[PDB]
Design a protein around this ligand. Structure first.
Ligand SMILES: CC(C)c1nc(CN(C)C(=O)N[C@H](C(=O)N[C@@H](Cc2ccccc2)C[C@H](O)[C@H](Cc2ccccc2)NC(=O)OCc2cncs2)C(C)C)cs1
Lengths: 99, 99
């Protein structure tokens, strides 16, 4: 699709058989989801946002369908109030910025 | 131009006669720049995201040039870790998300 930015770029994603809304975010280097139970072992990560840093748990090789396009990659889980799809999964599904 | 997201989408902006580097950010409603001098009256504002809220100075009707494209809109200035061009100016240069 082509998505204009007059409104927040919110899309449905499917992860773990649940549907969630997520923001398409070119300003996030990684993908961050609200607290959920994901499979396997995690690794620690600190990510910084506008107000400072949060500790998140890194899971790898996670499938997530973003608007019907399957991506498989690293997903961080921690105390974000919005699910953010960042560049790591946006390149997989072939997303670009055009102007 | 077409920008892939293997790397951070950083572009040069021209604002208040200085060239700065800033991130094209689909996940920021607002344009938030590092401490700089801007002419005008401004208003205090609080913006938040990951990590909490920060106080910025709101300046309205600032002309920014983003890669040669002229944009007018609100610019917030303050202790942001990175220069962010948010959706309020990305729509003005005709920026879309495509996949
Ligand atoms: C409440 C919620 C439902 C929402 N409100 C909003 C409106 N808000 C607040 C914003 O747009 N606020 C912006 C913002 O931080 N947006 C964020 C999404 C968000 C929104 C609300 C709450 C938490 C996260 C998303 C933005 O792309 C920022 C910008 C950025 C990049 C580097 C350093 C600092 C900042 N990205 C991140 O915070 O990325 C964190 C990372 C993830 N992986 C690696 S770093 C500001 C910069 C203005 C959107 S959704």
């Amino acid at each position: 699709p082509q998505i204009t930015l007059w409104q927040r770029p919110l899309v449905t994603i499917k992860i773990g058989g649940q549907l969630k809304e997520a923001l398409l975010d070119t300003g996030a280097d990684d993908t961050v989801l609200e607290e959920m139970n994901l499979p396997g072992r995690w690794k620690p990560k600190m990510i910084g946002g506008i107000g400072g840093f949060i500790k998140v748990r890194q899971y790898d090789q996670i499938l997530i369908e973003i608007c019907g396009h399957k991506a498989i990659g690293t997903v961080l889980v921690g105390p974000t109030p919005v699910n953010i799809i960042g560049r790591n999964l946006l390149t997989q599904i072939g997303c670009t910025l055009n102007f």
